């Protein structure tokens, strides 16, 4: 009945479906847990105990990562008029008595989660893992800031509480691999983007240095790199160039052509690269998954074959479909599937004897049958097939961005803290006061979390920018809001706009071939997929 | 020497390069000019005379289509304070004496251009063409409005001066074919977009009706379909939902999730369809060009064969390779290209040619040699290979949109004419006055031409919209500015964003393959293009 616990039995025909199930649904057994001579030791007994308790672990992660909004501003301590909310937010701030209660519970599960794969890896393997020295070093930094906050800089706990949450889920770590391979392409297209703003902030400063434009908005060259940056974003379109329009009507020809080249030529070609870098980096992940599948099926192959000659006979395959617990009657399948597998050796009268034959067989049952069952509108179809596929497909690629904003909030709370006050006199002339944003704030953590969202939508995103270049007084605040743009024109065009285009072309292709596959043959022909995945 | 015209010689050897050149560089011979028994008749003498005078014709089209900005408002005649510019623009308005001078010169050349292919088509063919009746009916409407304006509604000349200009250039007419085939896909994705604003203007009206949101912005349901439409555009992001955030901070979760689903899920999937509809409609145009190329090469085949058995002789191929004027060493090519063409009949040793064999041979010399002589940074390359390709590739697809704006100006001048005055008292409370746009205006034609551009960039595009819902006093002005969105966030996601993605993937497969186009073989194989275009 219950096929959950299996490492302690694991017969020669039963420890197949330990490996043959995990090759289908694609989980991971660790490579140290895979390379054993026995492959059913107390390592593997303790390993599936990690996957049992997994719902405790993610519930710790969102405990640790939703900690930060409930917790105090960096500076209420120098602040005058502390408790009275000057545009703060309605969430409570957990007190110092409430501090050690919430972090020690959080570390009591993180210390279990980090030092658990010692129970199935060697200490020369665990400590030489390099995605796991990172995860241990993140714990010790939290263990400092627990005990420092107990026994009483800028307190780098809330940055580490993100990076633990990034590395601990596989999806957000699998995503972040792509953003390292894409980064060597994106920085070149960033470098030919900055050249576009610089060469066209020069002509916009050459042309208008005499007139009523350069008297008013385009004074210094550093305030035409800055303005023409915001025109590239479109979000300041007619306001930049009214007094160059009002003076000579012909100066729209500069500005209606720069935004035309800027937004409709370059911005699609930053999208084109970051989509074309995605297609190569996604292929490097999927082939990084099939070698994980082939390195599972090769374990399943040699587990059955006793002499390890390199082959398995037909009768030695017939016993597997019953071990699969898949279909009712056995002998009508394996000889039927032999022709269905694209190449049969026919060196013996019955068997096809290779390793690569089985590694395609166990996946060939997967696409067709789905008969395991572990007991424990045509007009609108291609749109809502994708649109419902994309609620869990963009949970990593919109989870990375929610982690990028949990960093910029935590930077942006600290750099830009209790400045929007009720009584800051620079504020009441800014664009925050006149547009009455005066909230969307940065004065706390969740005030900042929303504000980065409006900066992410680009809905009037320069109101916040040009206020904090006047509240902080420096032009160095500009680099907070330019780096949000740059990093999230990868992340909003990689991870989303390139993904939702490819996600449509799957649920197009599954509609364009479902008319073809059901009419081409009664059974599935495998190489049409070999020409179909490389088709577009 | 001079071999420009040569329809009057047109030998068995001279009229071949009449057909063999036009099959390469792809001009058009009309199908009535193609189906003749002689194919060099008194009709064909005049056909190449049409292509000689072609620079007169484009220069007339731009005369006819850049007429409109230089010409008067629809209503200066009821207007008080006529000559004094109340926010008008600096272009002159050509007078009634200047009327008949500029239009009769313009109509002197339409009547040439329209009734010229009578000189190479029958009058039962010219008048049964369904395009060439549209282009005649457009002339007669201009001939009315010339003679009406001479001998002294809304004067539908400026709409026809666009549609003549659309049909007369081939690329703007070739483009507009696609926008009819895409239209049956776009109206469904319009219809499921329209449902998204309706179902989410309902929940935003169910939820916020009691509170300080529905007291202030969300009063009627027609003013939440309207507001949540502008949130879909993002361009009104925090202003809509301040007093539903100021009241409860928890009600950003509605509005930061609706824009997230709106702009990052739907808007990419309207892009995905309109890109996917482009790929099919562009393929239907390119195969509409090869059957035009095959229907030229079959004329070249039938010109050579006097027997018309179905085959041409090899010695006849070689002496017409010489008439091609291609290369200096002739006889080492034809048997060399026999292997280089993917198939050879090989029925006799020399002379066994199919019509499909020659149909690639004339293409075989084209893709490789490029020798005719009509005498008359690795890091950044794939970006600027596209970015320089796209100055003439997006001239049709940004010429259609410049024609869509030349209609909406001409509509939008007439509906919205003299409203923004110096002394309209509704104006000086509107968003046009406070943001001081107040030009961007619609009071003339080129004031309107710019204003549709800012509406096209979406830079604060609702300032104009909510002004004309208060200047015209009705909510029917909204439909002017919602149709500009709907029709041209097709045309800016079809014709640009989908095109610039495909234009990258060509000029990136001419680099990914170009290392293989020099290392795999020194002489080009044709069937890698069968595996290069179908697979990428
Ligand atoms: C604010 C809270 C939002 C709640 C989002 C719900 C996320 C559900 C997570 C439940 C399982 C997570 C395990 C973590 C990753 C490794 C395992 C895996 O491969 O997942 C397979 C899993 C499906 O397989 P199964 O759950 O094992 O059946 O796919 C997923 O749905 C989760 C993928 C990533 C999970 C974390 C990333 C999102 C967190 C950031 C919050 C984003 C807020 C932005 C709002 C957008 C809404 C439109
Ligand atoms: C307001 C002033 C705008 C002036 C812009 C000038 C644009 C130059 C286009 C002149 C060429 C007209 C071709 C005649 C009809 C097409 C036939 C053909 O096969 O063309 C081959 C031609 C190349 O072959 P070739 O010239 O024969 O060597 O392709 C083209 O270059 C033009 C294709 C589109 C046809 C005209 C559409 C443009 C007019 C709308 C103006 C757009 C303003 C928006 C600003 C965008 C700038 C970034
Ligand atoms: C790409 C993702 C963007 C994510 C933007 C994050 C949205 C966070 C907003 C949550 C605000 C919660 C305020 C709590 C108010 C209360 O209950 O008292
Ligand atoms: C393609 C790049 C060309 C444009 C590079 C030009 C930038 C150099 C600086 C221009 C003049 C600086 C204006 C005043 C600066 C100052 O001395 O304070
Ligand atoms: C990526 C290109 C631009 C990115 C960010 C734009 C920054 C340009 C703004 C420079 C500030 C103006 C220089 C200060 C002038 C002064 O000291 O008076
Ligand atoms: C991280 C590097 C990206 C580039 C950042 C800015 C590029 C050059 C810096 C702009 C400052 C130029 C201002 C000099 C002119 C002036 O202020 O008068
Ligand atoms: C992923 C870990 C963090 C990555 C970048 C975070 C740290 C960059 C800036 C954080 C502190 C900078 C603030 C300095 C100015 C100040 O404190 O007044
Ligand atoms: C997840 C990566 C994010 C890290 C990049 C953000 C850091 C860039 C600037 C942070 C603030 C620096 C400017 C502060 C100006 C000031 O001191 O007032
Ligand atoms: C990735 C970030 C891009 C960099 C954006 C530039 C931010 C730096 C500011 C530019 C000019 C400021 C120099 C003047 C200094 C001052 O006035 O205090
Ligand atoms: C997608 C294309 C958008 C096109 C927008 C059209 C720009 C037209 C603006 C031209 C204004 C001409 C006024 C000149 C005044 C004068 O020279 O006297
Ligand atoms: C998926 C579609 C569901 C939403 C459709 C609801 C639209 C019906 C109109 C709602 C009530 C109108 C509100 C007052 C208008 C009036 O009577 O004047
Ligand atoms: C594409 C979806 C909507 C398209 C344009 C939005 C139109 C909704 C606005 C309706 C106006 C309000 C109805 C009038 C109310 C009244 O008479 O008091
Ligand atoms: C061309 C059709 C597209 C749809 C246009 C609008 C869709 C329904 C019309 C909106 C008006 C609904 C207003 C009812 C509520 C009210 O007036 O108070
Ligand atoms: C392609 C030819 C034109 C297509 C659509 C153009 C005509 C639609 C509207 C034109 C006039 C409508 C104005 C009516 C209101 C009024 O005149 O007061
Ligand atoms: C190129 C196609 C464009 C045709 C579509 C535009 C016509 C839709 C509305 C035009 C104005 C209609 C609303 C006018 C309101 C009023 O009378 O004040
Ligand atoms: C394709 C165009 C989309 C249509 C957008 C709707 C345009 C008008 C819809 C709302 C009009 C409100 C009806 C009340 C009329 C009035 O108050 O005068
Ligand atoms: Ca064996
Ligand atoms: Ca067999
Ligand atoms: Ca304002
Ligand atoms: Ca805006
Ligand atoms: Ca013959
Ligand atoms: Ca031969
Ligand atoms: Ca925008």
Curated annotation (Swiss-Prot), chains A, B:
Disruption phenotype: Plants display an impairment of both the Ca(2+) inhibition of stomatal guard cell opening and abscisic acid (ABA) inhibition of seed germination.
Sequence ranges on the Vacuolar membrane side: 72-99, 210-215, 231-252, 408-444, 460-480
Cysteines joined through disulfide linkages: none
UniProt intramembrane annotation: 216-230, 445-459
Keywords of this entry: Acetylation, Calcium, Calcium channel, Calcium transport, Ion channel, Ion transport, Membrane, Repeat, Transmembrane, Transmembrane helix, Transport, Vacuole, Voltage-gated channel
Protein's GO biological process: calcium ion transport; calcium-mediated signaling; regulation of jasmonic acid biosynthetic process; regulation of stomatal movement; seed germination
Main location: membrane
Family matches, as InterPro entries: EF-hand-dom_pair, EF_hand_dom, Ion_trans_dom, TPC1_plant, Volt_channel_dom_sf
Pfam families xrefs: Ion_trans (PF00520)
Parts of the chain on the Cytoplasmic side: 1-50, 121-137, 170-188, 274-376, 377-386
Topological category with respect to the lipid bilayer: Multi-pass membrane protein
Subcellular location: Vacuole membrane
GO cellular component, one term: plasma membrane
Gene3D superfamilies: 1.10.287.70, EF-hand, Voltage-gated potassium channels. Chain C
Activity-regulation annotation: Inhibited by Al(3+).
Chain spans, region Disordered: 515-536
Cross-referenced PROSITE patterns: EF_HAND_2
GO function terms (MF aspect): calcium ion binding; identical protein binding; voltage-gated calcium channel activity
Domain EF-hand, chain residue ranges per copy: 292-327, 333-368
Basic and acidic residues bias locations: 515-524
Listed transmembrane segments: 51-71, 100-120, 138-152, 153-169, 189-209, 253-273, 387-407, 481-501
Protein family per UniProt: Belongs to the calcium channel alpha-1 subunit (TC 1.A.1.11) family. Two pore calcium channel subfamily.
Recorded domain comment: Each of the two internal repeats contains five hydrophobic transmembrane segments (S1, S2, S3, S5, S6) and one positively charged transmembrane segment (S4). S4 segments probably represent the voltage-sensor and are characterized by a series of positively charged amino acids.
SUBUNIT field: Homodimer.
Its biological purpose: Functions as a voltage-gated inward-rectifying Ca(2+) channel (VDCC) across the vacuole membrane. Is one of the essential components of the slow vacuolar (SV) channel. Acts as the major ROS-responsive Ca(2+) channel and is the possible target of Al-dependent inhibition. Involved in the regulation of germination and stomatal movement.
Protein name: Two pore calcium channel protein 1
Organism: Arabidopsis thaliana
């Amino acid at each position: 009945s219950e096929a959950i616990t299996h490492g302690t039995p694991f017969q020669k025909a039963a420890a197949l479906v330990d490996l043959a199930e995990d090759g289908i649904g694609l989980p991971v057994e660790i490579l140290d847990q895979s390379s054993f001579g026995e492959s059913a030791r107390y390592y593997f007994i303790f390993t599936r105990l990690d996957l049992i308790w997994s719902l405790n672990y993610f519930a710790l992660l969102f405990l640790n990562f939703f900690e930060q909004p409930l917790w105090c501003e960096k500076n209420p301590k120098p602040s005058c008029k502390d408790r009275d909310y000057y545009y703060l937010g309605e969430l409570p701030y957990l007190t110092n008595a409430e501090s050690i209660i919430y972090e020690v519970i959080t570390l009591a599960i993180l210390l279990v989660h980090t030092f658990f794969p010692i129970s199935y890896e060697g200490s020369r393997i665990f400590w030489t893992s390099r995605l796991n020295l990172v995860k241990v070093a993140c714990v010790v930094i939290l263990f400092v800031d627990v005990l420092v906050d107990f026994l009483y800089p800028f307190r780098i706990a809330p940055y580490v509480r993100v990076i633990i949450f990034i590395l601990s889920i596989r999806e957000l770590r699998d995503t972040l691999v792509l953003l390292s391979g894409m980064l060597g392409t994106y920085l070149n297209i960033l470098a030919l983007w900055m050249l576009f703003l610089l060469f066209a902030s020069w002509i916009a400063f050459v042309m208008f240095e005499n007139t009523q434009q350069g008297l008013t908005v385009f004074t210094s060259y550093g305030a035409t790199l800055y303005q023409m940056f915001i025109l590239f974003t479109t979000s300041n379109n007619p306001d930049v160039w009214i007094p160059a329009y009002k003076s000579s009507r012909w100066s729209s020809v500069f500005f209606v052509l720069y935004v035309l080249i800027g937004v409709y030529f370059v911005t699609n070609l930053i999208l084109a690269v970051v989509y074309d870098s995605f297609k190569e980096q996604l292929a490097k992940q999927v082939s990084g998954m099939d070698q994980m599948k082939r390195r599972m099926l090769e374990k399943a192959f040699g587990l059955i074959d006793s002499d390890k000659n390199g082959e398995i006979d037909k009768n030695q395959c017939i016993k597997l479909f019953e071990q699969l617990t898949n279909y009712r009657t056995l002998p009508k399948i394996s000889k039927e599937e032999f022709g269905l597998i694209f190449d049969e050796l026919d060196d013996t009268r019955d068997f096809k004897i290779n390793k690569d034959e089985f590694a395609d067989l166990c996946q060939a049952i997967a696409l067709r049958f789905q008969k395991e069952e572990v007991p424990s509108v045509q007009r609108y179809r291609a749109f809502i097939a994708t649109f419902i596929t994309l609620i869990p497909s963009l949970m990593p690629y919109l989870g990375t961005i929610f982690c990028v904003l949990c960093i910029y909030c935590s930077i942006g709370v600290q750099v830009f803290g209790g400045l929007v006050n009720a009584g800051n006199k620079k504020l009441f002339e800014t664009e925050l006061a006149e547009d009455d944003y005066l909230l969307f704030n940065f004065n706390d953590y969740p005030n900042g979390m929303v504000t980065l969202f409006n900066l992410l939508v680009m809905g009037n995103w320069q109101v916040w920018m040009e206020s904090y270049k006047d509240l902080t007084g420096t032009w160095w605040s500009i680099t907070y809001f330019v780096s949000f743009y740059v990093i999230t024109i990868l992340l909003l065009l990689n991870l989303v706009v390139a993904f939702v285009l490819e996600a449509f072309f799957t649920e197009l292709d599954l509609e364009e071939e479902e008319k073809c596959q059901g009419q081409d043959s009664q059974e599935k022909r495998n190489r049409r997929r070999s020409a179909g995945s490389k088709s577009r």
